Amino acid sequence: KVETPLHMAARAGHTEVAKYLLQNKAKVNAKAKDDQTPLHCAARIGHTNMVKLLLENNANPNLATTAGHTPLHIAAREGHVETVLALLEKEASQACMTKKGFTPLHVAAKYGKVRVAELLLERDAHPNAAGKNGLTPLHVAVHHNNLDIVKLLLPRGGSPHSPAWNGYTPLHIAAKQNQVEVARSLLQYGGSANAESVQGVTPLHLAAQEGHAEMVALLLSKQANGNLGNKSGLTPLHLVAQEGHVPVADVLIKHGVMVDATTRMGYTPLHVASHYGNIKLVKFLLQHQADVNAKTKLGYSPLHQAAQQGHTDIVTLLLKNGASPNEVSSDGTTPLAIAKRLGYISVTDVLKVVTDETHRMSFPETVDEILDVSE
């Protein structure tokens, strides 16, 4: 791999052979395949003394590979504290960033190296450095679930309020991934539970969507707004209806969240729960006074959504709870007409009993937000 003898000495760690090679004839900053210097190979294995020798002779720490990894990045990846100290003593730049946008502090946060992160933050590291994606070391520490790295970054200036490209905070990632302790630390250091993404998504929205009842209770204890909606008007109860978590809906309803909150197009949580086929949450909402005959702006009932999506048991439960057939939407379709249109035999059979004698599909708004911070 375009390997010089100095590279081979660097990988193994014989400092005397490399000393003699550098004495007679060897380029210290010689590059190999994947643009690797002998400093990179010495920092990967963590041989401190050989690193000091190479750096003392002519090695430049700022040289980076095709992936953008300086020897500081590799030493932070493998948690070599003495190698990091020697490199920083020989003017290694922590401002150097990989192609992904990672500083050595970012790599330490990713791989949980708390001693390397301690040393870097001790000597001239910005806790809130970010790349094009806007990810901070706190973002990576929360994403990879490094509690020690978070608890070390927060006192020294790791900001919970730092937004990513999509507007996500570290508290967003903590709430989505059910990292309760990380969430408590972030909220202790000023994290806001009502911080919004580019689409209006709050950490409460992500916690309710992912079915983390303890996380939802923790956020609600910190001035989270359960009635707050995203750009499409979807509430955390709407996301609970989309995925179907009864315990989260219990906490939300006990907090005081409006059961019949409407989106931009008039969809209620009962509408979404009937659409997505979560019968238990339909029962829960109907027990908590949801409007069974609620209509959207286009006149669609939850029974309309149930017939359109073919949920026969949802249809039966709605009719048992007072859903009214023969009601006509603005498109001119009854639930029996929709069931006949997409040919759901069971839904048609159930609806034909309670319906008297006489090409648009209704879809609730959804959240397409997702964060790409892995790898």
From Swiss-Prot:
Post-translational modification: Regulated by phosphorylation. Palmitoylated.
ANK repeats: 1-30, 34-63, 67-96, 100-129, 133-162, 166-195, 199-228, 232-261, 265-294, 298-327, 331-358
Modified positions ((3S)-3-hydroxyasparagine) in chain numbering: 29, 194, 227, 293, 326
Residue stretches spanning the membrane: none
PTM-bearing positions, type Phosphoserine: 324, 346, 374
(3S)-3-hydroxyaspartate: residues carrying this PTM: 260
Tissue note: Isoform Mu17, isoform Mu18, isoform Mu19 and isoform Mu20 are expressed in skeletal muscle. Isoform Br21 is expressed in brain.
Disease linkage: Spherocytosis 1: A form of spherocytosis, a hematologic disorder leading to chronic hemolytic anemia and characterized by numerous abnormally shaped erythrocytes which are generally spheroidal. SPH1 is characterized by severe hemolytic anemia. Inheritance can be autosomal dominant or autosomal recessive. Patients with homozygous mutations have a more severe disorder.
Assembly and interaction partners: Component of the ankyrin-1 complex in the erythrocyte, composed of ANK1, RHCE, RHAG, SLC4A1, EPB42, GYPA, GYPB and AQP1. Interacts with a number of integral membrane proteins and cytoskeletal proteins. Interacts (via N-terminus) with SPTB/spectrin (beta chain). Also interacts with TTN/titin. Isoform Mu17 interacts with OBSCN isoform 3/obscurin. Interacts with HIF1AN. Interacts (via ANK 1-5 repeats) with RHCE; this interaction mediates the primary membrane attachment site for ANK1. Interacts (via ANK 1-2 repeats) with AQP1 (via the N-terminal). Interacts (via ANK 1-13 repeats) with EPB42.
Domain observations: The 55 kDa regulatory domain is involved in regulating binding of SPTB/spectrin (beta chain) and SLC4A1/erythrocyte membrane protein band 3.
Protein function: Component of the ankyrin-1 complex, a multiprotein complex involved in the stability and shape of the erythrocyte membrane. Attaches integral membrane proteins to cytoskeletal elements; binds to the erythrocyte membrane protein band 4.2, to Na-K ATPase, to the lymphocyte membrane protein GP85, and to the cytoskeletal proteins fodrin, tubulin, vimentin and desmin. Erythrocyte ankyrins also link spectrin (beta chain) to the cytoplasmic domain of the erythrocytes anion exchange protein; they retain most or all of these binding functions.
Protein name: Ankyrin-1
Naturally occurring in which organism (per UniProt): Homo sapiens (Human)
UniProt lineage: Eukaryota, Metazoa, Chordata, Craniata, Vertebrata
Residues of the full protein shown: 436 to 818 of 1881
